[PDB]
Amino acid sequence: SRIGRLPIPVPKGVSVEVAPGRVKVKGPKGELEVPVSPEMRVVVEEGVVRVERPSDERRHKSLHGLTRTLIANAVKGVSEGYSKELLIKGIGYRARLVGRALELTVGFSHPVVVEPPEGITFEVPEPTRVRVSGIDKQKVGQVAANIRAIRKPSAYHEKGIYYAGEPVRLKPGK
Amino acid sequence: MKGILGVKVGMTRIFRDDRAVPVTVILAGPCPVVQRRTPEKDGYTAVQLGFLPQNPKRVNRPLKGHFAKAGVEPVRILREIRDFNPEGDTVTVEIFKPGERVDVTGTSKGRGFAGVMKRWNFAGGPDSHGAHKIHRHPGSIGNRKTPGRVYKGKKMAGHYGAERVTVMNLEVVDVIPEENLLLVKGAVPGPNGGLVIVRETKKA
Amino acid sequence: MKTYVPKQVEPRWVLIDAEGKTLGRLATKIATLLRGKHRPDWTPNVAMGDFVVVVNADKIRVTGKKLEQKIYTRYSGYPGGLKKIPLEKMLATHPERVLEHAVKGMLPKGPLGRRLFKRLKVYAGPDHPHQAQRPEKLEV
Amino acid sequence: WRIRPRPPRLPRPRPR
Amino acid sequence: MKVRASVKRICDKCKVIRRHGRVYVICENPKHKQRQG
RNA sequence: CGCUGAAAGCAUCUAAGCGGGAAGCCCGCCCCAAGAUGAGGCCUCCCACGGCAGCCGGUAAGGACCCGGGAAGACCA
RNA sequence: CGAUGUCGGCUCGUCGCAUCCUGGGGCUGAAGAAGGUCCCAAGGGUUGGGCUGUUCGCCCAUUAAAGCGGCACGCGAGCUG
Ligand SMILES: [Mg+2]
Ligand SMILES: [Mg+2]
Ligand SMILES: [Mg+2]
Ligand SMILES: [Mg+2]
Ligand SMILES: [Mg+2]
Ligand SMILES: [Mg+2]
Ligand SMILES: [Mg+2]
Ligand SMILES: [Mg+2]
Ligand SMILES: [Mg+2]
Ligand SMILES: [Mg+2]
Ligand SMILES: [Mg+2]
Ligand SMILES: [Mg+2]
Ligand SMILES: [Mg+2]
Ligand SMILES: [Mg+2]
Ligand SMILES: [Mg+2]
Ligand SMILES: [Mg+2]
Ligand SMILES: [Mg+2]
Ligand SMILES: [Mg+2]
Ligand SMILES: [Mg+2]
Ligand SMILES: [Mg+2]
Ligand SMILES: [Mg+2]
Ligand SMILES: [Mg+2]
Ligand SMILES: [Mg+2]
Ligand SMILES: [Mg+2]
Ligand SMILES: [Mg+2]
Ligand SMILES: [Mg+2]
Ligand SMILES: [Mg+2]
Ligand SMILES: [Mg+2]
Ligand SMILES: [Mg+2]
Ligand SMILES: [Mg+2]
Ligand SMILES: [Mg+2]
Ligand SMILES: [Mg+2]
Ligand SMILES: [Mg+2]
Ligand SMILES: [Mg+2]
Ligand SMILES: [Mg+2]
Ligand SMILES: [Mg+2]
Ligand SMILES: [Mg+2]
Ligand SMILES: [Mg+2]
Ligand SMILES: [Mg+2]
Ligand SMILES: [Mg+2]
Ligand SMILES: [Mg+2]
Ligand SMILES: [Mg+2]
Ligand SMILES: [Mg+2]
Ligand SMILES: [Mg+2]
Ligand SMILES: [Mg+2]
Ligand SMILES: [Mg+2]
Ligand SMILES: [Mg+2]
Ligand SMILES: [Mg+2]
Ligand SMILES: [Mg+2]
Ligand SMILES: [Mg+2]
Ligand SMILES: [Mg+2]
Ligand SMILES: [Mg+2]
Ligand SMILES: [Mg+2]
Ligand SMILES: [Mg+2]
Ligand SMILES: [Mg+2]
Ligand SMILES: [Mg+2]
Ligand SMILES: [Mg+2]
Ligand SMILES: [Mg+2]
Ligand SMILES: [Mg+2]
Ligand SMILES: [Mg+2]
Ligand SMILES: [Mg+2]
Ligand SMILES: [Mg+2]
Ligand SMILES: [Mg+2]
Ligand SMILES: [Mg+2]
Ligand SMILES: [Mg+2]
Ligand SMILES: [Mg+2]
Ligand SMILES: [Mg+2]
Ligand SMILES: [Mg+2]
Ligand SMILES: [Mg+2]
Ligand SMILES: [Mg+2]
Ligand SMILES: [Mg+2]
Ligand SMILES: [Mg+2]
Ligand SMILES: [Mg+2]
Ligand SMILES: [Mg+2]
Ligand SMILES: [Mg+2]
Ligand SMILES: [Mg+2]
Ligand SMILES: [Mg+2]
Ligand SMILES: [Mg+2]
Ligand SMILES: [Mg+2]
Ligand SMILES: [Zn+2]
């Protein structure tokens, strides 16, 4: 019933050195940095990284779980990476890859091209499944939200761009 | 952002593709670079220009020494184009070619002490139905005790014109390099023989 | 006996590194210094204080959400000419005016008052041009 | 807009 | 979004939160969505 | 409307942080403007004149008066 | 009360926003179009007539829309009467 105390499994070889207000995390698939509150303490154990809180008042209790799960996600990013899949639904609808960019054909009049930032790399298996890959969890999560937003899952029909595992809830029409 | 000094000469219309295009003609070229404004010494970027040769008699001493340091003979007008640094040291009409698009700045025709109907497109008073000596008069100018005063900037009568006016996005119709003529479809501020400036347009 | 009033004295130049100090609390000591009340011979009716040179007025600091919520204002005299620009925007464009405005409202109103304002010289950035007077650095 | 019509308090000025 | 001075839970899935100094009621049922004002 | 996310093992747009988002706000356009007494900047011109931080003169570069005028204008400019 | 000229009109506007339109949104018993309703927003716009002194109101023909109010029911050392 608490996340600030659950220590962080650090696989090998992940490099989690600590700085005042920073925690650097070098991994096999890249490096990330974590801004950590200067009131929290990050600790380096044998293959484990642990975070301690300086008190038990609300803010130090709130910062605690955060600056853990933050340093957690950075270890799982540089090592085994983060992905997110987008299914496409709608008769005319389809998406393709133009070099290192993504061109959606989602029923406007133009087609829409997304540009993957630094870190994000697109990939399209089928013409109806897009995949966003990157070591940053938050950044992967933005891009996927970004892309999906272009044609959010409609209300009445099974048309739009859907999150992996998105419930297909609709409403009657007549 | 290129400019040139010039003088408005007079209006006409020509025929281009069986359409009548009313133009005004501007004796633009040529304008010798008299001074260059550089950030190191001045702060911004611009070129001082020159127009209309002048009697070296008429040009006084401090002015003369200025002209000379640049190598220019005395000229009647100095004006600066801002954010302009041409490669040569003399500007001609050929920095514009037809199809371009210009902003033109002159001094408007001065209407002196103009009324409130001429200056502000007011509507005065009735000319019958008992209207009494107020046919060209503005109307009410304020309220009553609250605020008990007159808004700053209130539109009243006064001088109108003989002010700077810039007109935007004017089609360059044709350029006559030999006679230093610049054609521009539309209305340019000021009278014929009035000094004007022709820069590239701000619009797009 | 009558109270001593002083002949015109040589004024003192004074330096402050306004960095990381609180706006109103530094503003209040710069006012005292400009008024020259730190002086045993203080006379109310003449500029006798100091010349206060300030640097890093851009790196001044302030509590609360005042950055987004301290709104400075100007009235042009015209209909609708009340303009309201918050603190952060001020620092973005004219940051010396922040501290400058603060000292001003803590100075007196009247002639001498705004003449004392002229004896302040606030500078954004680390440096100042007043090396000629060689201002004594005060840690306030 | 004042619904109840408001009677003049002063006469139209006349020479005295 | 319903705006009112009485934000209340409507169903058992309605949730009360305070984001940006204002009381909300978020829920999966979009009618139940509320703000205070 | 979100991403990431604890307090609160779940959830939460927020408590740390990052997005998206109005004819609206700030720039940007046109015009006035250093009497901005905080009176700015640059280019050029004159320059140590005679006498008992002041005065009296003659001058310098310049300016003004006066005149011909002007799509400038009430006079002034 | 040894005077604070009083409806409506004209003229000139200026502000408020409890927004008529234009812009941005959530919810809809929102298929689309089109509406309903609440939130943000005062930048700009908000027609011409018939009747009556009329403000208001009805009506005609349009409209993106034909907003509501404050300013001594703004405005008679500005006009009307
Ligand atoms: Mg002619
Ligand atoms: Mg031709
Ligand atoms: Mg000119
Ligand atoms: Mg003129
Ligand atoms: Mg005239
Ligand atoms: Mg006219
Ligand atoms: Mg006019
Ligand atoms: Mg007219
Ligand atoms: Mg009229
Ligand atoms: Mg008329
Ligand atoms: Mg009329
Ligand atoms: Mg009469
Ligand atoms: Mg008459
Ligand atoms: Mg009259
Ligand atoms: Mg009038
Ligand atoms: Mg008043
Ligand atoms: Mg004039
Ligand atoms: Mg104009
Ligand atoms: Mg055009
Ligand atoms: Mg004193
Ligand atoms: Mg003093
Ligand atoms: Mg007082
Ligand atoms: Mg009488
Ligand atoms: Mg709502
Ligand atoms: Mg209720
Ligand atoms: Mg929920
Ligand atoms: Mg969600
Ligand atoms: Mg979680
Ligand atoms: Mg979430
Ligand atoms: Mg926050
Ligand atoms: Mg943002
Ligand atoms: Mg988004
Ligand atoms: Mg933005
Ligand atoms: Mg527009
Ligand atoms: Mg100017
Ligand atoms: Mg000056
Ligand atoms: Mg000037
Ligand atoms: Mg001032
Ligand atoms: Mg002074
Ligand atoms: Mg001075
Ligand atoms: Mg000076
Ligand atoms: Mg000067
Ligand atoms: Mg300067
Ligand atoms: Mg004259
Ligand atoms: Mg004359
Ligand atoms: Mg005269
Ligand atoms: Mg004269
Ligand atoms: Mg009375
Ligand atoms: Mg009296
Ligand atoms: Mg009387
Ligand atoms: Mg009286
Ligand atoms: Mg009435
Ligand atoms: Mg509102
Ligand atoms: Mg809309
Ligand atoms: Mg609307
Ligand atoms: Mg239907
Ligand atoms: Mg619809
Ligand atoms: Mg709606
Ligand atoms: Mg508006
Ligand atoms: Mg009508
Ligand atoms: Mg009739
Ligand atoms: Mg009528
Ligand atoms: Mg009527
Ligand atoms: Mg009626
Ligand atoms: Mg409509
Ligand atoms: Mg309609
Ligand atoms: Mg009203
Ligand atoms: Mg009104
Ligand atoms: Mg009232
Ligand atoms: Mg009254
Ligand atoms: Mg009235
Ligand atoms: Mg009046
Ligand atoms: Mg009246
Ligand atoms: Mg009268
Ligand atoms: Mg009246
Ligand atoms: Mg009156
Ligand atoms: Mg009166
Ligand atoms: Mg009568
Ligand atoms: Mg009569
Ligand atoms: Zn619910």
Contact call for B and C: 3+ CB–CB distances under 8 Å: yes
Q: How far is residue E8 CA from its own chain's centroid?
A: 7
Distance between CA C14 and CA C39 in Å, rounded? 14
Between the CA of B111 and the centroid of ligand 44 the distance, in Å, is 14
Distance between C109 CA and the closest CA of chain B, angstroms? 26
The β-bridge partners of B171 are B101, B185
Distance between first and last Cα of chain D = 35
* Residues of A 59-78 whose CB lies less than 7 Å from any atom of strand F: 59, 61-66, 68-70, 73
- E strand or H helix at A148, and its extent? helix A137-149
Between the CA of C120 and the centroid of ligand 40 the distance, in Å, is 14
Q: Integer distance in angstroms from CA B163 to C1' F74?
A: 19
Distance between CA C17 and CA C126 in Å, rounded? 8
* Residues of A 113-172 whose CB lies less than 7 Å from any atom of strand F: 137-142, 144-146, 149
- Helices and strands (DSSP H and E) totals, chain A: 2, 13
Asked whether the beta carbons of B5 and B51 are under 8 A apart, the reply is yes
Asked whether the beta carbons of C124 and C4 are under 8 A apart, the reply is no
| ∠ CA A73-A77-A81, rounded to 5° | 135
Q: Does C79 touch chain B (CB under 8 A)?
A: yes
> Closest Cα partner for A29 from A70, A76, A61, A69?
A76
3-state secondary structure of B78: strand
Read off the tokens for A92: 């005319």
Distance between CA B65 and CA B165 in Å, rounded? 32
- Whose tokens are 């260059």? That residue is B36
Nucleic strand F within 7 A of Cβ B110: yes
Distance between CA A34 and CA C137 in Å, rounded? 40
The β-bridge partners of B10 are B25
Q: Nucleotides on strand G with an atom closer than 7 A to protein CB?
A: 3-8, 10-15, 25-32, 38-40, 43, 55-56, 69-76, 78-81
Q: Which residue of C has its CA nearest to B147?
A: C79
* Residues of B 119-158 whose CB lies less than 7 Å from any atom of strand F: none
Distance between CA B43 and CA E9 in Å, rounded? 64
3-state secondary structure B175-188: EECCCCEEEEECCC
Distance between CA A87 and CA B174 in Å, rounded? 58
Instruction: Give me the DSSP letters along B14-61.
Output: EEETTEEEEEEEEE---EE--EEE-TTTTSS-EEEEEEEE--TTTS-H
What does the DSSP 8-state code read for residue B147? B
What count of other Cβ atoms lies within 10 Å of the Cβ of residue C86? 14
CA torsion through residues C1, C3, C6, C11, sign = positive
Asked whether the beta carbons of B46 and B80 are under 8 A apart, the reply is yes
Q: In what order do the strands lie in the sheet with A160-163?
A: A121-123, A129-134, A82-89, A160-163
Asked whether the beta carbons of A131 and A122 are under 8 A apart, the reply is yes
| B115 Cβ contact list (under 8 Å, min separation 6) | B136, B157
| B172 Cβ contact list (under 8 Å, min separation 6) | B96, B97, B98, B99, B100, B101, B102, B182, B183, B184
Distance between B145 CA and the closest CA of chain C, angstroms? 17
Distance between CA C36 and CA C111 in Å, rounded? 16
Question: What single letter denotes the amino acid at residue A134?
Answer: G
Shortest CA to C1' contact from E29: nucleotide = G27
Ion ligand 32 — residues with CB < 5 Å = A 149
- E strand or H helix at C87, and its extent? helix C87-93
Provide the phi-psi class of B17: left if phi over 0, else alpha when psi is between -120 and 50, else beta. left
Q: Where are the beta strands (DSSP E) in chain C?
A: 12-17, 50-55, 71-75, 82-86, 120-122, 136-137
Distance between CA A130 and CA A116 in Å, rounded? 12
Name all chains with 3 or more CB-CB pairs below 8 Å to chain D. none
The reply to whether E19 sits in an annotated binding site is no
Long-range pairs for C117-120 at CB < 8 Å and ≥24 separation? Answer: C117/C34, C119/C11, C119/C34, C119/C47, C119/C49, C119/C50, C119/C51, C119/C52, C120/C30, C120/C34, C120/C51, C120/C52, C120/C54
Chain B hits for C79, CB-CB cut-off 8 Å, are: 151-153
Read off the tokens for E13: 């899935």
* Residues of C 65-84 whose CB lies less than 7 Å from any atom of strand F: 83
| B140 Cβ contact list (under 8 Å, min separation 6) | none
Q: Does B153 touch chain C (CB under 8 A)?
A: yes
Asked whether the beta carbons of A117 and A123 are under 8 A apart, the reply is no
Backbone angles phi, psi at A171, to 5 degrees: -140, 150
Asked whether the beta carbons of A72 and A64 are under 8 A apart, the reply is no
Distance between CA B38 and CA A32 in Å, rounded? 45
What count of other Cβ atoms lies within 10 Å of the Cβ of residue A29? 14
Asked if residue B147 has a cis previous peptide bond (ω within 30° of 0), the answer is yes
Shortest CA to C1' contact from A84: nucleotide = F3
3-state secondary structure of A96: strand
3-state secondary structure of C134: coil
- Sequence positions preceding breaks in chain D, C–N over 2.5 Å: none
Read off the tokens for C134: 């060689």
Distance between CA A143 and CA A84 in Å, rounded? 9
Q: How many residues are present in chain B? A: 204
Read off the tokens for A118: 């630094």
- E strand or H helix at B200, and its extent? strand B195-200
In angstroms and rounded to an integer, the radius of gyration of the C-alpha atoms of chain A is 20
Read off the tokens for C91: 């620092």
Of the listed ligands, the closest to the CA of E9 is 80
Distance between first and last Cα of chain C = 37
Backbone angles phi, psi at B5, to 5 degrees: -85, 150
Asked whether the beta carbons of E24 and E36 are under 8 A apart, the reply is yes
Chain B hits for C77, CB-CB cut-off 8 Å, are: 152
Q: How far is residue C91 CA from its own chain's centroid?
A: 16
Q: In what order do the strands lie in the sheet with E22-26?
A: E2-4, E34-36, E22-26, E15-19
